[PDB]
Amino acid sequence: XLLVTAGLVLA
Amino acid sequence: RGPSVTAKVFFDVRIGDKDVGRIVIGLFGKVVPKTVENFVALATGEKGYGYKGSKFHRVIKDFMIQGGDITTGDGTGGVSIYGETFPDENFKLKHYGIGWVSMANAGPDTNGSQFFITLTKPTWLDGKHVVFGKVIDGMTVVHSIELQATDGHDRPLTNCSIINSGKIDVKTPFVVEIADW
Ligand SMILES: [Ca+2]
Ligand SMILES: [Zn+2]
């Protein structure tokens, strides 16, 4: 997808 | 009306060996004081660690550029001035459009050092990421980073580095108008 994460980057 | 920019932070950016210019971010200290304090302190490096030398490790055109991993550096790390993480302060500000500055996280209440600058209006992140600032100068620098060739992890092929960071005092606070505020 379109997320802004720190560790597990997802769809 | 709208909230006031009460402080500013600069990042001087280098892509590979080329100096590409400076990004100035205005900060809404009265809206989110705790979040602004963390970001300013990391920018100046006053606690002994900070943004200087970190990079924008994840860049997606028309979405955002992401930076501020000040420990491991691969995008999995980062720490705040308050500890490993700190809670979401509030969600008063939204990702209103391009150039808003917001905290990356790993779910609720896991703010650290990493942040992002929007290159769209990502409404799906409203209420999930704490917005605390706004790019006031250097949107062309943000665009230069945005256009960098990236791999399949969305990592620039050439490092986009923050070679210096710090604060600029705001002697005269000014309003950033926000529809319906
Ligand atoms: Ca476009
Ligand atoms: Zn262009």
Residue numbers in the entry:
A (entry chain I): 1 to 11
B (entry chain A): 32 to 212
Give sentences from the paper.
Cyclophilins are peptidyl-prolyl isomerases (PPIases: EC 5.2.1.8) and are characterized by their ability to catalyze the interconversion of cis and trans isomers of proline. In order to understand the molecular basis of these results, we sought structural coverage of the entire human cyclophilin enzymatic class. We determined crystal structures of seven human PPIase domains—PPIC, PPIE, PPIG, PPWD1, PPIL2, NKTR, and SDCCAG-10. All cyclophilins share a common fold architecture consisting of eight antiparallel β sheets and two α-helices that pack against the sheets. The active site of the cyclophilin family includes the invariant catalytic arginine (Arg55) and a highly conserved mixture of hydrophobic, aromatic, and polar residues including Phe60, Met61, Gln63, Ala101, Phe113, Trp121, Leu122, and His126.
